[PDB]
Write a protein that binds this ligand. Structure first.
Ligand code: MG
Ligand code: MG
Lengths: 489, 497
DNA sequence: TGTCCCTTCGCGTCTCT
DNA sequence: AGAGACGCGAAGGGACA
DNA sequence: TGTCCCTTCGCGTCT
DNA sequence: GAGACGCGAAGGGACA
């Protein structure tokens, strides 16, 4: 109770009583809250756990941790208890939407601003509630909402943006800055020898915001002339968060990396056109000679690994783990590169290192299969999900390990496996598909929505044959099923 | 003081006489055509070049030679084609068909030389494809349109927000240079002062006379929307055609005359005006409605329907002339005459029914109803003549019933579908095992020809993107959405995989 | 007049759902 | 299949040399 | 310092 | 294979 106990002691005391219901927090969730919301947020969570989880709020422990774990966490926790009922009962927002709004730094501010501005933004011929929630669901959500309120009319009338484009620009961290900068720089950027309005909107909408736009304004002429890049390549580099950083890094490193038998400008653009393109470029500069000597990789492979987001993390992890993977696990350098060459390459590699024994011994997969699974984006998720669901998919649903590996071996493998698990019985028992056909559908990128679109059109239809529908689902997934509505209708 | 043109006419007739012989064998129509547009010098150039064009290494058909010759400067275009056709086909990768297409307009020489000179910079420095460059070149003033596209493509995309496709669409009309410069000047005025989207502006600009239509929408939009009570959408719709300027001015004149004196709505007036020759259709309605509706004759709504299409004026006058004979001597109802008249080329279809209804019925065993159905689409004349031509071979050689032939014929582009079925049915059925019924079903839709061609393309040079579909699935798709469905499916597979 | 360019009208075909 | 979009050719005027 | 806001980076999924 | 989209984590400046 009431004392001047020190910070850590205060924390561990609050944590002590937070081990059981309604909210049993672990060390992980505790640390998570501490790192952003602080001991303040931990104390808030303690103080309010019963009200937060009880009626009529009924928030889960996960939702509570999600709100608590940001700067101003206590403020957001206090504010949602007030405003969730209001926003839900008076404005028809879902609790999920309200929690989404609250789960950012300064969430209190965003929630209060949605309360105030939702009635003025969502009048006739205005924004949809969904658009308002999207805009509010970022740090500085209040600033973004007030700025859309202000500049929506001039951006649409004077510059001819659609409301949808204005929302796209606004729906990022620093959205207020992106909107004001678009409004200022459109005229200057969109002249002969500049960018198209479409390109400026892309830059403003992809997360690099104000910084990326100002840096393009500044560096376009020299990057396009002295550095020989096309405007399109400059826009590609700028069209990520931290675009400014990547652009300045390309300006600095182009005359380094593009020397005799170095990289091409196109290779440099490729490396830089990812989140953290700066880190990826600098790491290529630093590690290309050593990965090629020590670990036997080629410059082409190094560029391949660098050419995704998490480039730096993947390159450093290859440098660190290629030996053990090759020796303690008998993989080849080409296999390690294949696992590394995706978003999350680092995670994929560490998960292969951790999980390859249990999967090959206890589950009887081949290292080749494990590598196949790991060699996509989200590879870590796919590995862990195969570990989790292999036995239930094979035992209860009658699949072969080969089929499970097939479902797992694309981007979104986790989602595909979980969806197959959900929907295999209804597709087979109610609509007469085979497990082979379900597996066929699931075994592509976009497997999950392909399966959901097919169970949708099969449960209540608007016609091609079922086999034709399965064939379309395999060929182009959900988009194929939707694009055939745009005809038969 | 003899007529000055006497010697010229005489020379013309001498050479023209000589051209009926090998290796060209021009008929009277072709010769007349060439004289009328290319002139005596064009006829003479055809004579002098006959051997160089016919066989040699060009292998132009006589129809192609006639198409190049029959324009202002046709002599020049003939010289330039024999010079640049090989250059453009092997240095730039164009087909001879594309080269002839570029050649076949006034100032064809200019267009060919400008394509030779600018195709590289337009494809490399500007990102255009050769198809797009050929499309821009393939109109009168094509040289001007190409140079203007080069000059203005960046400022139209960057300063004004157009896509390259939009710029190409604007440029790909006679007077394209004029339309491009006008869009440059007027897009901000039309968009910001009047609330038009750039899409509406491109739509107005993308016709022959684009510049005239844009300047006229600028001038008349305020008067038409405030006073006459038209919406901007309706004004854009009127403007969005060749002779847009003439249509808009005529709508301003005749809107209140038509509404007050005949009880038309503004929407009906807009519909009449929103065709090529909208002006003509309006003036003819004002003139002819009382006559046609006379003695409880046609109803006003019927007159409006006839006028609400392309060649409105021609259709109205032809109906005035031919309703009696068609109804009396041929036994059509006036309802059927109206249906036949209510399409682009209504006049042509009416005349062709008058001529071919007795033959198609007696010689080919069709009903008048079948003849009317064939006639009652755009290009009805072409479909009727094609049915006359191909009914015997489609039935006797390919096993189709007359009912099937009629169904193929009874859509827009029916001539095309019929000719393409005649051409492709043997390979579709014998070589790939489609049934005649499946071929007939694919062809019995608007766009039947390209749907059939898409299908044959996929069966003879399989694209991996479509291999997951069986022949029957390909058929169902082709029936549902024609070539566009097939093409859209390819893209879907590319993204998804 | 020969040649180039532009506008208007009539007519024919395909696409979009 | 109803409405809109796409697109070819004939034919006349301006312009100039 | 905690709260707010903006920027940058890593990662996962779908087209 | 590349590119678009969007979630969450972290770092740091302003500020009262
Ligand atoms: Mg990938
Ligand atoms: Mg003339």
């Amino acid at each position: 109770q009431w004392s001047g106990a020190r910070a850590l002691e205060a924390l561990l005391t609050v944590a002590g009583e937070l081990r059981g219901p309604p909210l049993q927090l672990d060390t992980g969730q505790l640390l998570k809250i501490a790192k952003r919301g602080g001991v303040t947020a931990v104390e808030a969570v303690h103080a309010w756990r019963n009200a937060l989880t009880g009626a009529p709020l009924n928030l889960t422990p996960e939702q509570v941790v999600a709100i608590a774990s940001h700067d101003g966490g206590k403020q957001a926790l206090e504010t949602v208890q007030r405003l969730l009922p209001v926003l839900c009962q008076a404005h028809g927002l879902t609790p999920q939407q309200v929690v989404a709004i609250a789960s950012h730094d300064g969430g209190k501010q965003a929630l209060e601003t949605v309360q105030r501005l939702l009635p003025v933004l969502c009048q006739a011929h205005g924004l949809t509630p969904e658009q308002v929630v999207a805009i509010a669901s970022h740090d500085g959500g209040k600033q973004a909402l007030e700025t859309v309120q202000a500049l929506l009319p001039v951006l649409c009338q004077a510059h001819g943006l659609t409301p949808e484009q204005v929302v796209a620009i606004a729906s990022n961290g620093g959205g207020k800055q992106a909107l004001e900068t678009v409004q200022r720089l459109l005229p200057v950027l969109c002249q002969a020898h500049g960018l198209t309005p479409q390109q400026v909107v892309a830059i403003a909408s992809n997360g690099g915001g104000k910084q990326a736009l100002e840096t393009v304004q500044r560096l376009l002429p020299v990057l396009c002339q002295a550095h020989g890049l096309t405007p399109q390549q400059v826009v590609a580099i700028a069209s990520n968060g931290g675009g400014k950083q990547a652009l300045e890094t390309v300006q600095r490193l182009l005359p380094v990396l593009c020397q005799a038998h170095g990289l091409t400008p196109q290779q440099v653009v490729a490396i830089a056109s990812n989140n953290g393109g700066k880190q990826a470029l600098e790491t290529v500069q630093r590690l290309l000679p050593v990965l090629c000597q020590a670990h036997g990789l080629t410059p082409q492979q190094v560029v391949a690994i660098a050419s995704n987001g998490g480039g730096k993390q993947a390159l450093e992890t290859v440098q660190r783990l290629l030996p053990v993977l090759c020796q303690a696990h008998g993989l080849t350098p080409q296999q390690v590169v294949a696992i590394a060459s995706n978003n999350g390459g680092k995670q994929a590699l560490e998960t292969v290192q951790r999980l390859l024994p249990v999967l090959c011994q206890a589950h009887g997969l081949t290292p080749e299969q494990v590598v196949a699974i790991a060699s996509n984006g989200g590879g870590k998720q796919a590995l862990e999900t195969v570990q989790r669901l292999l036995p239930v998919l094979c035992q209860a649903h009658g699949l072969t390990p080969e089929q499970v590996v097939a479902i797992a071996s694309h981007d979104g493998g986790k989602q595909a496996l979980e969806t197959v698990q959900r929907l295999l019985p209804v597709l087979c028992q109610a609509h007469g598909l085979t497990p082979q056909q379900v597996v066929a559908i699931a075994s592509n990128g976009g497997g999950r929505p392909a399966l959901e679109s097919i169970v949708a059109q099969l449960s209540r239809p608007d016609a091609l044959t079922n086999d034709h529908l399965v064939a379309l689902a395999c060929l182009g997934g959900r988009p194929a099923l939707d694009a055939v509505k745009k005809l038969e209708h």
